Amino acid sequence: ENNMNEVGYDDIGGCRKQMAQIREMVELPLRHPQLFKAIGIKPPRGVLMYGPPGTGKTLMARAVANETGAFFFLINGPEVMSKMAGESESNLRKAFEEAEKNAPAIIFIDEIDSIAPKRDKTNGEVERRVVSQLLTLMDGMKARSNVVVIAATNRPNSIDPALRRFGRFDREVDIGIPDATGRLEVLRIHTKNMKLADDVDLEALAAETHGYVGADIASLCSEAAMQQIREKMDLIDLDEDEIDAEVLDSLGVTMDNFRFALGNSNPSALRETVVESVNVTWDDVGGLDEIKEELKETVEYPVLHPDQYTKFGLSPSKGVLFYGPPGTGKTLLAKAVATEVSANFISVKGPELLSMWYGESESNIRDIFDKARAAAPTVVFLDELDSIAKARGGSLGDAGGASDRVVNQLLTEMDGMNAKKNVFVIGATNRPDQIDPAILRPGRLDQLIYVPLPDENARLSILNAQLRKTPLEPGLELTAIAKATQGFSGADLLYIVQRAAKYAIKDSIEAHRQHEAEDPVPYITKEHFAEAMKTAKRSVSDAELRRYEAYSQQMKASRGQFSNFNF
Amino acid sequence: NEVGYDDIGGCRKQMAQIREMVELPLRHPQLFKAIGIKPPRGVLMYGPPGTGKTLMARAVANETGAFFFLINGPEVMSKMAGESESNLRKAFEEAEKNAPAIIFIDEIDSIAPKRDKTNGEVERRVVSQLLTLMDGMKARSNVVVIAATNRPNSIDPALRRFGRFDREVDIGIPDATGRLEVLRIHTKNMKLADDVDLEALAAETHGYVGADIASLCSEAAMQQIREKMDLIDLDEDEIDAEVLDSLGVTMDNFRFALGNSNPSALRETVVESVNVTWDDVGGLDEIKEELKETVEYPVLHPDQYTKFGLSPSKGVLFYGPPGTGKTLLAKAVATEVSANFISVKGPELLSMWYGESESNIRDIFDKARAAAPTVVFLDELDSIAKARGGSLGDAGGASDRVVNQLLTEMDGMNAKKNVFVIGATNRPDQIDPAILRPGRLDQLIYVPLPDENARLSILNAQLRKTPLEPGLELTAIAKATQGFSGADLLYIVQRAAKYAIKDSIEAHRQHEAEKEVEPEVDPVPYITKEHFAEAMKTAKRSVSDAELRRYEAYSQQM
Amino acid sequence: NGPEVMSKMAGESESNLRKAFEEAEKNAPAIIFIDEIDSIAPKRDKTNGEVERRVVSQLLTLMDGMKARSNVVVIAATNRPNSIDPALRRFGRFDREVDIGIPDATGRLEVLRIHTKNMKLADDVDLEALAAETHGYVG
């Protein structure tokens, strides 16, 4: 039943404004012509559809074709051209004449980018003839007779400017990323035919989905269904002959399938730059309670609690910069944020983004930040900012100030002609004095969090976090280790634990060797720690510590002229 | 259908010239013989798209009863053994044999590319055949050819030589008055409300040319139709009559239309509308008045300089320490100046290919000059204008050629088609001395660190859309916050808002927790004194003292 | 030949390669010798020219696919082996990268003996001394 599969205006959703604009533009000049003679002016007869892929442009066109009772003719982009000299223009002429004569009709030009690039960047011949013929067909003598032209593109900036003038393409509709309500609506339309268990909650699914657009939602649904099929095809055999009727019914793709598929899938934009999901949890990061709570506090509310921000009418805080001696756990905190927080993560290294060609670094940065704001809300981690943020003008001899142009590009991109809806930059630098002065400014990276060397209770917390899975001796107490280590870092405690594990594995494999010659060790013993902390050192010396404390106290001195401040 | 001289608007001088050229050698050949001059044979038309050139050609075709023959550039070629030559020959044969007709070829650039630039053999044949027939059509054969090209530089000069195409007509773009008559022409066939005053509408329509006015009118009509359709419950099955005579487009429709439209030239580089108003930038009032006066005076009071016979200053450069509303001022002018606005980020123009960069700079400056007046915002000038030096780290002086091209294409500014260059740099020392010329970025504005009253203005203007306590005084913070930049105050206020949100959500889920086992949704509907105290306990300074010292020295230089 | 195959026109270099391979397999069990592949198969990562990417992809496809080869062998020669995509340098495309270094003094003796096998000469001259003093020469 092709009628059942036919997609009406009900199918398309999440873009009701553009739907209304296109629906009126197509029907009102073909439903109330007397009204349009009464108003005095004629309606527009050219529209340009543009937006990222997987938003519903072709679906919108299909809905228009199904609903409107007028003739509908479709032209794919590259289809017109042919090897023999001068047939493409013949194709356009025959298409237009047949479309116009055979009742009032709707033209749709799919992927116009293949036809009209710029009229001056191309170097062929036939293409310039096709664009000139198209211009003539759009406007001239008897330009159009009760016909309107729709075009679809993903990169409207590669279009001839002559096409974007009134008379050729009058109105440009922007079908962008759906909102939370929009994604909820698309989820509802795409899940109206499959069988759901009562437990499913589409509102939560729309809540944790942050950048999925259209086909992304469809993919999520499809993969979830496939997972349910791979959950109920495990109890039943292959049964190549046929499927029994008791199992085909009562399938019921439950909510955990949706949770699993959402935890696996990523937005269609981000899959190019997807990073492996390193497994970390908040209990893994010991100590630094105020830092973790502050991070969670500033990241989870603007994305989940926008009503209060609208109520107060202030934008949220965007930037954050960790700085301190190496190994204190800033990168570890970044790992925790990347793995647990619901917002999207873009992990980029410091000098990874540079490039050989001229200006391509700036293009790469523009691409990354445009990608980040496209699938917003997103959090971007800039590790080792001192690689990218150099003090401008210090390098007389350089590659043409490429570093200077890079840092200036970053400055303008993080604060410029941008709506700045939801972008969170995290900074992590082990040399925070060499960073550019403007980057530390509020409004770009306002929160400078110092991660000092852990205290004894913080070293104890770190140790408890680092042994949360290893089997341990019942009579073993970490309090002595904490009381004995003072200047160590988290990496140093990890080193001590690894050494203890090394001695434990050595004893285990030796004992197994004698056993086979003719599980002795159930867990790590006291003596493995007694012999594992004799090769312990302090990672950061007193010079680096004195530098970082001098920096912190210089900031605290800059914190002057503060008091009780009674109101 | 029925288009005549009444339809055409603007370009009266060009209209008179074309009228003479097309009527006199066709209705009075005897007078041409009597005076003793052979009438011209060919006229080309060029200019930006949508300037009514094709409309004018149709009006000339209709008004004059002479036989007409339309040919379109890309429509003369064929497949059967190069029948394009035969096509043009038969076109000329029909044009001569039928009557003393008139021949009009549109978009000649499609059928006349430069010889070296086009590679192939059929193109050579068609261009040469066009040349020979255009030569052979003698003067006494009473026919004239009208050429209409969107781009004049796409034709080889051989077609432009005297005796084949001698008369040029630069239609260009209309002035404010031309826009006024174009509006009047377009609106003389619809029901206009009484309150419409087209003079104002032409005072604010700036970059619109020829056809964009029609788009504005039609879309405004649409706005009225939708405003009146939903209220009347116009069912898809029914037809309304009593509403029909009452539909009238109001002024608010046109305000909406102007706020939501864009000149077609600027359609590529349109930026999404971000609201900023002159009341949000509390401080720097003297800069606000100076900028508004200097940018508006050439646009509203031209006569003063004409009587003085002087060229008012055009360029200006903002410099100062980070975060003092420079980009905010750019946004404010972009929103509330009543002129076009094109901002470009520094590094966008550079590229790896050879030459395209400067070509893009030419494209942006051509676009800026075409839809004049405009305001070009150069943010982060520390990326383009760099001390050349003998460092030799450039890629064959690629930065050097780019900056030199920018200097050559920005220094050739004319008093006509005024384009105002806005500069904005963080570190003023690394810009080249060539940017301080009187004819190039003359004005040097310094954005200083704010004072106590300026800081109070910053706070009160920044929290306008913010619920507050009734009994709260902001003088204390001003007295305390001394070297604090505006961005730092934004940090303070955002932190206070964050603490308010923390308290609100805490009370919320608390009350809910006792609920499960309407009232005031927010027991803290506004920030409070202790929230501000706790936000201010952890505040920091933005700019250090070394930057202040070096900027003070730089200011002290002049 | 190395640079002969590449053509500015679209879809000709790969056309030449396809024609060569099909005729080679058609006629009889034969040996191909693509000399200076480095001018035909540069690093896909570091290249910008579309035609080189096209030719290297075509070579990869034809050399290995669905029933790619049937009793045919191919030989490659380069002056440097590093500037080639790794996908060519695995088993099934170029199995073993055999080296051929500068000839030894012994090799000088054999090459001189080969050269002088048909040229009449004085008896006094000795080949071993000539080879010893000809150090550094090649082929």
Binding site: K83, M84, A85, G86, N123, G124, E125, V126, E127, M356, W357, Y358, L396, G397, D398, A399, G400, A402 | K79, M80, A81, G82, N119, G120, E121, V122, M352, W353, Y354, G355, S391, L392, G393, A395, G396, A398 | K8, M9, A10, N48, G49
Partner: peptide
Amino acid sequence: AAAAAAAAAAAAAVAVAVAVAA
């Protein structure tokens, strides 16, 4: 009949170098 043909040959790119001021 006489056929047409499309052709796109090449372009020119720009590299960037680093220097040391010893």
